[PDB]
Amino acid sequence: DLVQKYLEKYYNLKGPVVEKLKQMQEFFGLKVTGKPDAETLKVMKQPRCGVPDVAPRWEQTHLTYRIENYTPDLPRADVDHAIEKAFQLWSNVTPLTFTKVSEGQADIMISFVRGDHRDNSPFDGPGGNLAHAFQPGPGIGGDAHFDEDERWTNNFREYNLHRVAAHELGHSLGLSHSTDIGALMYPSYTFSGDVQLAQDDIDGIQAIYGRSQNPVQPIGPQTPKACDSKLTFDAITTIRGEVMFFKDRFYMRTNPFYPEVELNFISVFWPQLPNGLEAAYEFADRDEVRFFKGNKYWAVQGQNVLHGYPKDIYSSFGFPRTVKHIDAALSEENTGKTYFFVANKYWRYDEYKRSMDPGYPKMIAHDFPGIGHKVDAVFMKDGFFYFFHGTRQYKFDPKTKRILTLQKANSWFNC
């Protein structure tokens, strides 16, 4: 149905359907069954690149491009900047250079087109297929087509032209789709903060064109792996009955439809949150989650961020200015007491009085023996405190002040 079309378009489906569906589920990290479960269908409905997921190089490293026409969605200058900046991402990590040409036939011709546009791959109206591009070669080789039926933006709203152009131009240069959800070359549209090459993208492009001569040696964000025993966390919170773990740009949480873990961008839920969260907790009575970075914090109700945030922590919680960031936090459901961990110390805040309890830079070591003097992340579940510090997870009883178990940080995951 949807399944048959998707597999035909993207998995070269000419039961052969069952095998193609398994291949699709493998690609997207779904449970490989060959059957169309609700998550599989969710993925199939995601806006994405029109290039298939299943099956060279420009000879020269100096390439030209031409923007044949411009979407009325944005000023021409924003279109030029979005495309220029996309070429720049790839040229930053290779010897490739790109020159914009204003007439004639370039290596890479860029256009905005609707439906049928004369190359055997028609677009499909708003959503679905957002764009496609052709592998290196003569004629239409290199060319990138954007579906004009999309609403193109220059910000976080769907769909950011710069983000999609960086992906399309990857194809133009010889790349194919990645299974890494952190990569620009992932098939489905994603957006998180500033568009950048993941390490997977850098590795893939350099394996075709080589490294740049820049003494830096540009690096990109690596995508966390749930079953990597070296996995550590930025922050963790309970949220409406489940536990969400945060690392860099991503959240992880258990999910029956994914064998190890559901891993996706934080921006799927909360685009306005900054990159690199430091702590998070739920205030259950207000149906609210709060995220901390530096001296600022953001409040959130389900998938929506509240107004007026960020707010600073000094005015809101009454920390002294000496506190420059918080390391971890949890709010205990039946008390309204929030514990904020800051290096080797902790504070207790009363949410209903909206002030710190008396007596409160206390030492973590005095009241939480055995977990060490620093906390990466913490949450509460069934009255226990689950402290994370590096690769180590402590299940700590606040009643007896004892460490029950000590496991890997990734132990909640089906590994």
Positions that interact with Cl ion (CB under 5 A): 235, 279, 328, 377
- Is the CB of residue 163 less than 8 Å from the CB of residue 243? no
Pick from 68, 119, 285, 312: which binds Zn ion (CB under 5 A)? 119
Q: Six-digit token pair at 309?
A: 């945030």
Task: For residue 312, list its beta bridge partners.
Answer: 296
- Per-residue contact string for residues 23-52; x = within reach of Zn ion by CB under 5 A: --------------------------x-x-
Binding partner at 244 among Na ion, Zn ion, Ca ion, none, C-beta below 5 to 8 Å by kind: none
- 163 contacts Zn ion (rule: CB under 5 A): no
Binding partner at 53 among Ca ion, Zn ion, Cl ion, none, C-beta below 5 to 8 Å by kind: none
To the query of whether residue 84 is one of the catalytic residues in this protein, the response is no
Pick from 129, 264, 331, 410: which binds Ca ion (CB under 5 A)? 129
**Quick count: other Cβ atoms within 10 Å of Cβ 300?**
22
Distance CA 111, CA 115 (A): 13
Distance CA 183, CA 166 (A): 11
- 238 contacts Na ion (rule: CB under 5 A): no
CB of 336 to Cl ion, least distance (A): 18
Binding partner at 129 among Ca ion, Na ion, Cl ion, none, C-beta below 5 to 8 Å by kind: Ca ion
Residues 93-112 within binding reach of Ca ion (CB under 5 A): 109
Q: Measured between alpha carbons, how far is residue 241 from residues 44, 214, 300, 318 in Å?
A: 27, 48, 15, 29
Among the options 19, 26, 168, 260, which is catalytic? Answer: 168
Distance CA 220, CA 141 (A): 28
The b/e string for 140-171 (b: 16+ C-beta within 10 A; e otherwise) is: ebbbbbbbbbbebbbeeeebbbbbbbbbbbbb
CB of 69 to Ca ion, least distance (A): 12
**Helix/strand/coil for 23:** helix
- Is the CB of residue 320 less than 8 Å from the CB of residue 313? no
- 109 contacts Zn ion (rule: CB under 5 A): no
Tell whether residue 125 is among the known ligand binding residues: yes
Q: With respect to Ca ion, which residue has the nearer C-beta, 17 or 74?
A: 74
Task: For residue 328, list its beta bridge partners.
Answer: 341
- 147 contacts Ca ion (rule: CB under 5 A): yes
Q: With respect to Cl ion, which residue has the nearer C-beta, 145 or 293?
A: 293
Task: For residue 112, list its beta bridge partners.
Answer: 146
- What is the size of the binding site for Na ion (CB under 5 A)? 5
Instruction: Point out the residue whose Cβ comes nearest to Zn ion.
Output: 49
**Quick count: other Cβ atoms within 10 Å of Cβ 309?**
16
When computed from its CA atoms, the radius of gyration of the chain, rounded to whole angstroms, is 24
For the annotated catalytic residues, the residue numbers are 168
Binding region: 49, 73, 107, 117, 119, 124-125, 127, 129, 132, 139, 141, 143, 145, 147-148, 150, 167, 171, 177, 234, 278, 327, 376
Which residues of this chain interact with Zn ion, rule CB under 5 A?
Answer: 49, 51, 119, 121, 145
